Design a protein around this ligand. Structure first.
Ligand SMILES: *[C@@H]1O[C@H](CO)[C@@H](O[C@@H]2O[C@H](CO)[C@@H](O[C@@H]3O[C@H](CO[C@H]4O[C@H](CO[C@H]5O[C@H](CO)[C@@H](O)[C@H](O)[C@@H]5O[C@H]5O[C@H](CO)[C@@H](O)[C@H](O)[C@@H]5O)[C@@H](O)[C@H](O[C@H]5O[C@H](CO)[C@@H](O)[C@H](O)[C@@H]5O)[C@@H]4O)[C@@H](O)[C@H](O[C@H]4O[C@H](CO)[C@@H](O)[C@H](O)[C@@H]4O[C@H]4O[C@H](CO)[C@@H](O)[C@H](O)[C@@H]4O)[C@@H]3O)[C@H](O)[C@H]2NC(C)=O)[C@H](O)[C@H]1NC(C)=O
Ligand SMILES: CCCCCCCC/C=C/CCCCCCCC(=O)OC[C@H](COP(=O)(O)OCC[N+](C)(C)C)OC(=O)CCCCCCC/C=C/CCCCCCCC
Ligand SMILES: CCCCCCCC/C=C\CCCCCCCC(=O)OC[C@H](COP(=O)(O)OCC[N+](C)(C)C)OC(=O)CCCCCCC/C=C\CCCCCCCC
Ligand SMILES: CCCCCCCC/C=C\CCCCCCCC(=O)OC[C@H](COP(=O)(O)OCC[N+](C)(C)C)OC(=O)CCCCCCC/C=C\CCCCCCCC
Ligand SMILES: CCCC/C=C/CCCCCCCC(=O)OC[C@H](COP(=O)(O)OCCN)OC(=O)CCCCCCCCCCCCCCC
Ligand SMILES: CC(C)CCC[C@@H](C)[C@H]1CC[C@H]2[C@@H]3CC=C4C[C@@H](OC(=O)CCC(=O)O)CC[C@]4(C)[C@H]3CC[C@]12C
Ligand SMILES: CCCCCCCCCCCCCCCCCCOC[C@@H](O)COP(=O)(O)OCC[N+](C)(C)C
Ligand SMILES: *[C@@H]1O[C@H](CO)[C@@H](O[C@@H]2O[C@H](CO)[C@@H](O)[C@H](O)[C@H]2NC(C)=O)[C@H](O)[C@H]1NC(C)=O
Ligand SMILES: *[C@@H]1O[C@H](CO)[C@@H](O)[C@H](O)[C@H]1NC(C)=O
Ligand SMILES: *[C@@H]1O[C@H](CO)[C@@H](O)[C@H](O)[C@H]1NC(C)=O
Ligand SMILES: *[C@@H]1O[C@H](CO)[C@@H](O)[C@H](O)[C@H]1NC(C)=O
Ligand SMILES: *[C@@H]1O[C@H](CO)[C@@H](O)[C@H](O)[C@H]1NC(C)=O
Ligand SMILES: *[C@@H]1O[C@H](CO)[C@@H](O)[C@H](O)[C@H]1NC(C)=O
Ligand SMILES: *[C@@H]1O[C@H](CO)[C@@H](O)[C@H](O)[C@H]1NC(C)=O
Ligand SMILES: *[C@@H]1O[C@H](CO)[C@@H](O)[C@H](O)[C@H]1NC(C)=O
Lengths: 173, 1242, 34, 34, 34
């Protein structure tokens, strides 16, 4: 089916990055016609500005030196019923740090009835010179070692204590 | 003895004097053979009036007649019609005819010819001539009785036998109506079917069976009272919880006031017409009913632009609902009998939320407790050259090798026929033809040689010989005649040779005994079932035959008959046979629409009740009858022609080291710790659903914790190795299983660390983590005992399992010969209509429509079919379980020659193949299985010597204590307060009258709840609030009053605390309900809080001595059912994880939809519980069987790395078949457990 | 001569076919004694 | 041949041997004359 | 006239005497009819 997932936040300078924009419709068996527009606010700037528009399986890129030649489609393809609207940056630079908005305009076609929807997804991307490791992996890596050792010393401690008792009893008689 | 004398007038005169003497101051009955003591009738004293043979009422004005069969008759000596005296020749001639057997045979043959004529929907014109012949015979039969005995005079006369009432009514009704020649045909047509009931009185030995079955009813009144009471309690629970939930619908929202035209026009708006216009609701494309929804977070979702509201009418023409007690009561009778309960299960969950699955788990469990009582209620009542050549051939025939070789050829021949399949290459077909030719010659030569060996044609003809000789003749004629080859059924008779093995396979022979009894000892009981089904088929056809065709547009969209109807006898019979299999709700909806509810409900329930009662009696009778009681020599002639000392330094240390390992491992602290981690690692498997990408953090944590868990279990294995030693460790299966799971985990760990995480073999080895919960089987002693008991019965189950496989193999081969390659059909995908024979007749025309870009035309095949023996076995399993058998049956009756387009019901008489299989492969086969399971579990219990086998030692002492607590009768203290006022109040509150007032007022409270309806007006709701308020006030006064007399002795009685604890729930329930209705609104809590009032109704158990003794018997089985329930949950949990790993992405189709699927642990458990009752397991397997173009191999799933939505048919079949078998074995042990407690209680 | 599975029988000298069947003191018809 | 006495009929539509047996709306049967 | 009532035959070649004999749809020799 379709599962909405949020994009990663930190993009490494010099290499690629994928900005996820997934918006699943409530009932999957319905059919609709969707197109998307992306708007971008760079760090140190206040107003959002459009950067590209995708519709009818053809991507249109706005005139922007910071984005020209290094943005390609990465979402749903081969259909007009788009549910994945991601874009792929082939070369991340510090111009790309800022707030993004992924606007989705979806028109649903029912029997003698059509509903024009609209959804806006927000993404905040920060650019770094080197990849970092998430805390969940940092904290868990040490924890499995603490549990492993703390359980290993516990086992031997009981063995020695019971070894003391059993050996003493056997030698008693 | 030996005293005979014609009844002369002086005999009557003596009688009337004898009565004067008696008044002034016996196994020999009519209709029974005369006892041997009296000897044979004199040479000329037969068929005349005689004197009575007994002193029993010897002085009555009575005389006796005899028959040439030595049967006895009794008559009243008073004249018939005040004219025909016994001494007149008028009586004598009719007496000689009435008693004659030939006279009865004519009547029996008359009714059988009459009942066959009732099967005609529109009889020809000449039927009237035959119709008047019957009435001529029937009217004559009555006359002989009237002229031979009195009409209605007291004593013994025509009308004093109740069966002659029907006979007289049948005859007179024909005269008054037909000769008047006016009436409502469909109304009085049914009274004629009463003629069929004449078979009961005419055929010998059927009157006793029916009389016993009628008196069989009065035993069940105790359980009928129980069943109705409990069904009403759960109907009130279900009514309260689900008022109006089944008419939630997705209606277009918001309202477009500009585009709205009410029916009156004027471009206005009217709300009542808005939520009743069907066009405003959402219907999933391809479905027949609008979609349900719910405002809860776990209920169904509406599309964008729709709102979830109560609109329209309830599903299934309005007959499926909880809006009213009557409709709620029906919905729970359906749930009790498990007829199509998965649809009610799914509809309720889609509107009330998935969290309400607990209600259906509870109702299904208790509903199984009713059935055990019902089964036990009925069980309690059944419980030259000629000589030279002849000797030469006879010397080789009858030799053990000749018999042994021919027996092997029978097995080899059967395996040869299983090789037939479709599509089959010309070379493969040629081998089958040549091989089959040889086999017929071998058996033909065998019978010819044995025909010569035994004197020609005379000594050979005996039981088995005539059969195989008939087969040989049939095969020879089939080889010669094309007309014989015309019909496919003839090849099946070769399969019957497989039973020739019964003489050497006792278990197979045990199946012949069961089948033989059904037409042997129990023939009359079986014949009653045949007559009962025939009458219902005719009765329903007469009442509803017209309606199904006049109102056809009401129940089918195309204005043509459905596939199940009562418009003719054969289709009427099939419906009656269908309800006997347990499917009555679906066919009753159609009948209610056309023929109304009152008359349709009545008849359908009588068939369900009377029909199942007779089937159950036959099934139990067969079981109790089952409980009644040179290969080697031929082989013999073929055979003829290190060990370090412990008493030393290291020996003490090393031996002590092993001793301490044992101490730690066995220590209860260590074992409990390990059990805690088996549940922790097993519970970590449930987080691997389709939403794992949204849980990046939890995925990381559980990934690392897997290292900790697998490290700990490695240490546990090493400690057990030293503590026990390799010899002891590798000797018991429980330690072997724990070793295997650890080894698999290590392989996936070191391999993962090395790399190759994307390897196909490793990925398919990762899915084996679902078996980790099996490590808990030996840690819980409840699970171990149940598993040990199940394994002990495996050797017995296998021997009967083989008979099931061989017996089912014959039906699988026979079905292949009839339906192999005949399930294909040409389908227009874009418009979804199977082409008619005019358009495409065969595969060739379908292909010619596929030329060019016509990608919408497909030559499809039914997924479950008889294309080969392997596929036949799956189809038979779906028929035997009555799940998915409708699609299999529909394709069979439509089938034509191979590679031909199906035509609607072109082969309608193919239904008989499935009728025969159900009777033989399911009804009798299940009889054989239960026959050994009951016997085996008695020997298993006996040889162990214990009273229980599903219970642990700790539970046994608790079980023993509970038995005594239910046997020590309570005392009767009378602690009078010795007070002026409290003395009198104590006296009357303790009188039986005071209890009767309480008991009756609770019943009025119960009825006050049934009056509630979803659509009730406010005024009715306003009234029903005050009435319920009074009952609360009255019942609290009862407690306050008794708590004023028995101030401190209330605790001494177990029911008063229940009365008190049920009371304080009533005041809080009503007072808090008002509070939550104004502040802190929470309707879902309001309904649940209101359920506390039903506690009062449970107080009826206090006085219901009839039902208390069974509710107590339930408590005895709970400790045993808990152990079995645990094992079922473990199996459900293991199969639940397998589903999520395999079927989480298959296409949403058939039985897989957006709420009931394997995408999540909750969804998998919901589906797995549904299958546990084997309910709709065909609709869940079908999507898994898809192959492209039915599915896409590279479909995208946004938010996931998975690709494709195709299933794996091989895994799908293994997954569902394995669970169906396993759940059947466990559930069968559940019934045996509860039945054992009830048997030991009764 | 014999009485059937559900035939009414006389407990005193019941003719229910042995060893399978026996008269019912309470129901007055043959039952399986098993 | 003809429809018999009290045979099914309408007041002007009987197939009976009328008027000897002839129709009436009170019974729609060719009641025999007497 | 006709051949013997059993003779080898093949589909799409009705060499057996007509119309009495017919080639079988299972095996390679002709068939009788009544
Ligand atoms: C799940 O949760 C969901 C959300 O919680 C929940 O959804 C809710 O469901 C309920 C029903 O179950 C909905 O309630 C109904 O709403 C209907 C529509 O209401 C709106 O329209 C009304 C009529 O509009 C006229 O008046 C307006 C004001 O003057 C004008 O603007 C309109 O234009 C129009 O006037 C003129 O203009 C038209 C041209 O434009 C012209 O054609 C037209 O003819 C006319 O001349 C409004 O009155 C109404 O406003 C009221 O309600 C909203 C909140 O809903 C308030 O904010 C307002 O302040 C105001 O109070 C809406 O704008 C209603 O029609 C409907 O009412 C009728 O039925 C109820 C009983 O259900 C009666 O009590 C009521 O009196 C009405 O009775 C009608 O029939 C009776 C006969 O039975 C008749 O005697 C009477 O005269 C009348 O004809 C009802 O309230 C609700 O809206 C849904 N949403 C929400 C958010 O609540 C869902 O049910 C849940 N599902 C489950 C399964 O739990
Ligand atoms: C004296 C006392 C002694 C007691 C001894 C112990 C007795 C009781 C226990 C016995 C152990 C039995 C276990 C046998 C299990 C074998 C299952 C098996 O080998 O399956 C393997 C297949 C492989 O799948 P794949 O790689 O093609 O998938 C590919 C999917 N991709 C592509 C996503 C990777 O799995 C699949 O197909 C998945 C679907 C099929 C699932 C089959 C059933 C599995 C579960 C069994 C539970 C048994 C519970 C028993 C409880 C007690 C009863 C008495
Ligand atoms: C030997 C054994 C013998 C067994 C004999 C059993 C006999 C049963 C007789 C049942 C007679 C029912 C008479 C009432 C019929 C009737 O005329 O009823 C009217 C009401 C009105 O309903 P409504 O206002 O929705 O109008 C219909 C609106 N529409 C179509 C949209 C839903 O219909 C209702 O309530 C119908 C409710 C009917 C519920 C019947 C449940 C029976 C369940 C089990 C019985 C065995 C245990
Ligand atoms: C409840 C009552 C219990 C009663 C028990 C009595 C009888 C046992 C019934 C068992 C049913 C057996 C089904 C066998 C099966 O499934 O037939 C093999 C399948 C189906 O053939 P097909 O449709 O593929 O043919 C395609 C042909 N064309 C392409 C020409 C169209 O063929 C395949 O693919 C193979 C797929 C793998 C099948 C594995 C079956 C596993 C069965 C038992 C597991 C153990 C259970 C106990 C623990
Ligand atoms: C390791 C595995 C174990 C391997 C062994 C398994 C054993 C069998 C395999 C399959 C049997 C079990 C499957 C099953 O559940 O279906 C049987 C069903 C149980 O209850 P159901 O609710 O399913 O059936 C509806 C109850 N009303 O029994 C039935 O009634 C079958 C339906 C027959 C009754 C309908 C009318 C027939 C009556 C007349 C038939 C004889 C008349 C005499 C003619 C001469
Ligand atoms: C009691 C039950 C378990 C019986 C099971 C019998 C199996 C040994 C048989 C029955 C059905 C058979 C299957 C039926 C059809 C096919 C398709 C067949 O496909 C082809 O041969 C490819 C196309 C071609 O013919 O060239 C491959 C074998 C297979 C899976 C067969 C494998 C062997 C199966 C599973
Ligand atoms: C006995 C063998 C089983 C022992 C273990 C029994 O517990 C495991 C499950 O019952 C609980 O699983 P969850 O409900 O936590 O999984 C889903 C969680 N989310 C995703 C909804 C948060
Ligand atoms: C559905 O709504 C979208 C906007 O929510 C419509 O797109 C706008 O259409 C207007 C013209 O009516 C233009 O002036 C805007 O520039 C459009 N905006 C965007 C972002 O495309 C769209 O036309 C609507 N579709 C229908 C069928 O009503
Ligand atoms: C990005 O562009 C720079 C030049 O500006 C180039 O050196 C580098 O290789 C590019 N990397 C990627 C991943 O596109
Ligand atoms: C990014 O911003 C700098 C600011 O000076 C500008 O020179 C440059 O052209 C922008 N784009 C890229 C790709 O660096
Ligand atoms: C995203 O773009 C990259 C650019 O090379 C491509 O390799 C990748 O397949 C794209 N992903 C999707 C989902 O289209
Ligand atoms: C129906 O329409 C007619 C025509 O305008 C009007 O006179 C009448 O009042 C309308 N009735 C209702 C109930 O609106
Ligand atoms: C239902 O609504 C549709 C759409 O406005 C209309 O065409 C139709 O006539 C309505 N039917 C009724 C019965 O009101
Ligand atoms: C299949 O159905 C479509 C839709 O009705 C129709 O246009 C098409 O002609 C049909 N195909 C054939 C072969 O008739
Ligand atoms: C198919 O049917 C057509 C008539 O519908 C017929 O002419 C043709 O011979 C048939 N072909 C086969 C192979 O059955």
């Amino acid at each position: 089916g379709c599962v909405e997932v949020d994009s990663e936040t930190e993009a490494v300078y010099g290499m690629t990055f994928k900005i996820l924009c997934i918006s699943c419709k409530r009932r999957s068996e319905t059919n609709a016609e969707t197109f998307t527009e992306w708007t971008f606010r760079q760090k140190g700037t206040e107003e959002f500005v459009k950067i590209l528009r995708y519709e009818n399986e053809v991507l249109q890129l706005e005139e922007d030196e910071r984005f020209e030649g290094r943005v390609v489609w990465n979402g749903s393809r081969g259909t007009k019923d788009l549910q994945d609207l991601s874009i792929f940056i082939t070369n991340v630079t510090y111009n790309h740090s800022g707030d993004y908005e992924c606007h989705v305009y979806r028109l649903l076609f029912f029997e003698n009835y059509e509903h024009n929807t609209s959804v806006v997804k927000k993404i905040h991307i920060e650019v770094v010179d080197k990849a970092n490791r998430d805390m969940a992996s940092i904290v868990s890596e040490i924890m499995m070692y603490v549990l492993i050792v703390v359980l290993t010393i516990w086992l031997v401690a009981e063995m020695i204590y019971c070894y003391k008792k059993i050996a003493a009893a056997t030698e008693t008689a | 003895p030996d005293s005979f004398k014609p009844f002369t007038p002086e005999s009557l005169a003596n009688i009337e004097r004898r009565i004067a003497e008696s008044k002034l101051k016996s196994d020999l009955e009519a209709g029974k053979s005369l006892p041997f003591i009296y000897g044979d009738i004199p040479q000329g004293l037969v068929a005349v009036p005689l004197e009575d043979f007994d002193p029993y009422y010897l002085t009555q004005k009575t005389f006796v007649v005899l028959n040439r069969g030595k049967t006895l008759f009794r008559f009243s000596a008073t004249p018939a019609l005040y004219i025909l005296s016994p001494f007149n020749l008028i009586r004598r001639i009719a007496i000689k005819i009435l008693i004659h057997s030939v006279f009865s045979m004519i009547i029996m043959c008359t009714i059988l010819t009459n009942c066959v004529f009732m099967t005609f929907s529109n009889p020809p014109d000449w039927s009237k001539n035959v119709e008047y012949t019957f009435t001529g015979i029937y009217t004559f039969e009555s006359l002989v009785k009237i002229i031979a005995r009195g009409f209605c005079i007291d004593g013994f006369t025509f009308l004093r036998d109740p069966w002659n009432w029907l006979d007289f009514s049948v005859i007179m009704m024909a005269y008054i109506t037909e000769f008047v020649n006016l009436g409502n045909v469909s109304a009085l047509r049914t009274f004629r079917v009463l003629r069929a009931l004449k078979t009961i009185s005419v055929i010998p030995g059927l009157k006793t069976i029916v009389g016993a079955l009628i008196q069989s009813v009065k035993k069940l009144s105790d359980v009928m009272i129980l069943t109705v009471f409990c069904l009403s309690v759960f109907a009130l629970i279900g009514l309260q919880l689900f008022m109006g939930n089944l008419r939630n619908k997705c209606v277009v929202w918001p309202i477009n006031f500009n585009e709205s035209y009410l029916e009156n026009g004027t471009k206005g708006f009217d709300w009542e017409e808005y939520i009743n216009n069907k066009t405003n609701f959402y219907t999933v494309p391809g479905m027949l009913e609008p979609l349900l929804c719910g405002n809860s977070s776990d209920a169904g979702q509406c599309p964008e632009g729709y709102q979830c509201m109560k609109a329209g009418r309830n599903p299934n023409y309005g007959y499926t609902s909880f809006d009213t007690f009557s409709w709620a009561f029906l919905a729970l009778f359906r749930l009790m009998t498990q007829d199509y309960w998965e649809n009610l299960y799914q509809l309720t969950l889609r509107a009330a939320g998935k969290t309400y699955m607990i209600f259906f788990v509870l109702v299904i469990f208790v509903g199984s407790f009713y059935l055990v009582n019902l089964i036990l209620a009925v069980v309690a009542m059944a419980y030259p050259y000629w000589i030279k050549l002849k000797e030469i051939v006879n010397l080789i025939v009858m030799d053990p090798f000749v018999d042994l070789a021919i027996t092997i050829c029978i097995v080899l021949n059967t395996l040869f026929m299983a090789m037939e399949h479709h599509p089959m290459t010309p070379q493969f077909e040629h081998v089958l033809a040549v091989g089959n030719l040889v086999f017929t010659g071998i058996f033909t030569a065998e019978m010819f040689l044995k025909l010569i060996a035994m004197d020609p044609y005379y000594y050979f003809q005996e039981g088995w010989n005539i059969f195989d000789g008939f087969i040989v003749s049939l095969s020879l004629m089939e080889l010669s005649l094309a007309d014989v080859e015309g019909l496919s059924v003839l090849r099946s008779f070769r399969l019957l040779r497989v039973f020739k093995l019964a003489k050497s396979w006792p278990t197979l022979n045990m199946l012949i005994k069961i089948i033989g009894n059904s037409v042997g000892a129990l023939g009359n009981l079986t014949l009653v079932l045949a007559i009962i089904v025939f009458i219902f088929a005719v009765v329903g056809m007469q009442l509803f035959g017209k309606s199904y065709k006049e109102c056809v547009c009401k129940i089918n969209q195309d204005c043509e008959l459905p596939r199940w109807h009562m418009h003719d006898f054969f289709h009427s019979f099939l419906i009656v046979f269908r309800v006997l299999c347990g499917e009555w709700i679906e066919t009753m909806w159609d009948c209610m629409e056309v023929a109304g509810q009152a008359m349709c409900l009545i008849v359908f329930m009588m068939v369900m009740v009377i029909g199942n009662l007779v089937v159950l009696n036959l099934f139990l009778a067969l079981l109790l009858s089952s409980f009644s009681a040179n290969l080697q020599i031929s082989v013999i002639r073929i055979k003829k022609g290190c060990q370090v000392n412990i008493e030393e330094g290291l020996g003490k240390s090393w031996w002590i080291l092993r001793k301490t390992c044992f101490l730690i491992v066995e220590h209860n602290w260590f074992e409990t710790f390990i059990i805690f981690m088996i549940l922790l690692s097993s519970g970590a498997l449930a987080f691997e659903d389709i939403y794992i990408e949204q849980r990046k953090t939890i995925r990381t944590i559980l990934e690392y914790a897997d290292k900790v868990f697998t490290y700990i279990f490695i240490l546990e294995m090493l400690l057990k190795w030293t503590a026990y030693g390799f010899v002891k460790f590798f000797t018991n299966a429980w330690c072997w299983l724990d070793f295997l799971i650890v080894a698999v985990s290590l392989v996936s760990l070191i391999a993962n660390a090395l790399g190759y995480s994307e390897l196909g073999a490793i990925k398919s080895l990762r899915t084996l983590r679902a078996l980790r919960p099996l490590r808990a089987l030996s840690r819980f002693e409840g699970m171990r005992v149940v598993v040990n008991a199940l394994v002990g019965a495996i050797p017995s189950i296998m021997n009967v399992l083989l008979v099931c496989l061989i017996f089912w193999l014959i039906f699988s081969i026979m079905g292949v010969n009839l339906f192999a390659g005949k399930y294909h059909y040409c389908f227009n995908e874009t418009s979804e209509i199977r082409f008619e024979i005019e358009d495409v007749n065969n595969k060739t025309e379908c292909e010619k429509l596929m030329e060019g870009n016509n990608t919408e035309i497909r030559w499809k095949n039914v997924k479950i079919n008889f294309d080969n023996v392997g596929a036949g076995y799956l189809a038979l399993l779906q028929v035997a379980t009555f799940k998915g058998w409708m699609d299999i049956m529909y394709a069979a009756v439509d089938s034509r020659k191979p590679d031909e387009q199906p035509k609607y019901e072109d082969n309608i008489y193919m239904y008989i193949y499935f009728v025969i299989f159900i009777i033989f492969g399911s009804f009798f086969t299940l009889n054989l299985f239960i026959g050994v399971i009951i016997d085996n579990f008695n020997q298993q219990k006996k040889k162990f010597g214990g009273q229980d086998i599903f219970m642990t030692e700790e539970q046994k002492k608790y079980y023993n204590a509970m038995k005594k607590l239910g046997s020590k009768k309570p005392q009767k203290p009378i602690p009078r307060p010795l007070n002026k006022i409290q003395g009198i109040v104590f006296d009357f509150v303790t009188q039986q009258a005071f209890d009767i007032v309480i008991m009756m007022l609770i019943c009025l409270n119960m009825v006050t709840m049934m009056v509630e309806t979803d659509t009730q007006s406010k005024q009715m709701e306003n009234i029903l609030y005050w009435i319920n308020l009074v009952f609360v006030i009255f019942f609290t006064c009862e407690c306050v009053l008794k708590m004023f007399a028995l101030r401190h002795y209330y605790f001494t009685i177990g029911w008063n605390i229940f009365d008190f604890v049920v009371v304080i729930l009533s005041i809080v329930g009503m007072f808090l309900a008002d509070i939550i209705e104004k502040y802190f609104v929470s309707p879902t809590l309001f309904r649940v809080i209101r359920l506390a009032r039903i506690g009062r109704i449970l107080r009826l158990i206090k006085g219901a001595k009839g039902i208390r003794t069974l509710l107590f018997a339930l408590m005895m089985s709970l400790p045993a059912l808990f152990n079995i329930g645990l094992l079922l949950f473990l199996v459900m949990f293991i199969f639940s994880i397998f589903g999520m790993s395999n079927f989480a992405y298959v296409k949403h189709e058939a039985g897989i939809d957006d709420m009931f699927n394997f995408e999540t642990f909750g969804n998998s458990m919901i589906c797995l519980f549904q299958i546990t009752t084997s309910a709709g397991w065909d609709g869940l397997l079908l999507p898994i069987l898809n192959r492209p173009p039915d599915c896409s191999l590279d479909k995208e799933h946004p938010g996931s790395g998975f690709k494709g939505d195709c299933g794996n048919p091989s895994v799908g079949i293994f997954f569902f078949v394995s669970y169906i078998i396993i759940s059947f074995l466990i559930v069968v042990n559940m019934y045996i457990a509860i039945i054992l407690e009830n048997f030991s209680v009764a | 001569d014999c009485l059937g599975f559900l035939w009414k029988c006389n407990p005193s000298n019941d003719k229910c076919c042995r060893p399978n069947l026996v008269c019912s003191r309470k129901d007055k018809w043959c039952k399986y004694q098993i």
